[model samples]
Target: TFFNPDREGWLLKLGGGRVKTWKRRWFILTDNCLYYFEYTTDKEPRGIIPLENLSIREVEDPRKPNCFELYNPSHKGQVIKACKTEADGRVVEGNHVVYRISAPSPEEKEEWMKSIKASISRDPFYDM
Candidate 1:
């Protein structure tokens, strides 16, 4: 019931629970496999998060790629990486400004999805 051809692999929850729809698709280019939950609605095509803020760190190791972590209050123990871009397109040779956003674990992902759903239910007019 979770699969639909039109939604491009996104998981959706129908209003009355009679039918489920796919809302969004997530993809990454890295070899590291990670998973996260994302939701979307008609009004605001993109999703939104409440109760979460970004945390950053400067990478000092010259051997390792520069990176930072993003923390969420809802899941204090969880740490997600921030995305970074290289100036010269070579991560090793030149200086880079690293940025990252955390990818939530399966459990934390579910929690955040539920929280977002509840908030949407409470405030139907909420804007993204």
Candidate 2:
């Protein structure tokens, strides 16, 4: 989240599985969760991750400029799948440990990194 309470913007998301690709998406940070969608006006997220028990770090990428990864080290081969419905959805899983992402610029990248870190720290699950 931002200092304003919520942050919404664009980011390049690294796709999972064998087909490694960078997809541009509209990302929203709110309610201790991260959500991304194909368009800014979209009602639902392409994927969602609760900002709990998660860690983020800046990482190196030769091909990409500003890069980082969100990972959950406490769990093994575990990740939250994107669900569209209670019945069925496409479960894309490959990089179980980390969700790679990139920003347009270094300033934007650092801003997002700090925002996400703050959001993760405020999660109620860690209140215990």
Candidate 3:
């Protein structure tokens, strides 16, 4: 389900005489779960393809078995209080949570940031 981010201009006509292009970020449905990487473009995801009639085994991919599960309300609002009283770091302000991590290089920083974003994207239930 890897999409070519460079492709555009192709359109699909609907029954109501309306046309639409594939604009949403596509996700790979692996054997254990659905996986998606952040789109390189600026457009945000408008909707998600629903996961139906899916079992835990059906979504499992041996190569990438570490499936990420969505966050649940049971632990959603828990504040990750910083243990270090010496420094005022890591705070949960309202719905937002902030963290401070030290990375040696730009590549490491980018990787960490992407991982953080992916983690934040998870929810207890599908919003759709």
Candidate 4:
């Protein structure tokens, strides 16, 4: 499983968001919200990926193993200036794209991926 309460930490590495610097943050999924923080105990969150009005998925990294992808549908038109190359990343169709986080196992990544899809499908905001 990708996440569980206290017993199984939900934190995961997010392949560098804009510059590919790589981030290992604590993530929490609850109250129909996905929030990430630099430290598990940090009172303020680094960022939040709202579950109700969002689309998320996974992608395999051609250059790295144990990778997953996140597409930012809301910011579909924004460009990642930190990108050094096309592989650095880009938005596609109507989603702003981002990359390469690692999971403990293939199954772990899949859990998060499928969960996000389910959340989207069950959410009414995504009917468009």
**Pick by TM-score: 2 or 4, better one:** 2
Q: lDDT value for candidate 3?
A: 0.28
How do the residues 1-128 of candidate 3 rate in per-residue lDDT, one tens digit apiece? 33532112211111111342222233333222333323534243222222222111112223322222222233444332212111234422222121112233445334433443443345344333
lDDT of 4 by residue, 46-106 (tens): 5555555455566665554456655556567443222122333542221234534566677
Predictions in order: lDDT: 0.29, 0.76, 0.28, 0.52
Report clash pairs, candidate 3: 31-58, 31-59, 31-60, 32-59, 32-60, 33-59
TM-score-better candidate, 3 vs 4: 4
Best to worst by TM-score, what's the order?
Answer: 2, 4, 3, 1
Q: Quote the lDDT for 47 in model 3.
A: 22
Stronger candidate by lDDT (1 vs 2): 2
Best by TM-score: 2
Question: Candidate 1 at residue 101, lDDT?
Answer: 31
Question: For candidate 2, which ten residues in a row score worst on lDDT?
Answer: 80-89
Among residues 3 or more apart in sequence or in different chains, the pairs in candidate 2 whose N, CA or C atoms overlap within 3 Å are none
lDDT score for residue 16 of model 3: 12
What is candidate 2's CA lDDT for residue 70?
Answer: 87
Off by over 4 Å in 3: 1-98, 125-128
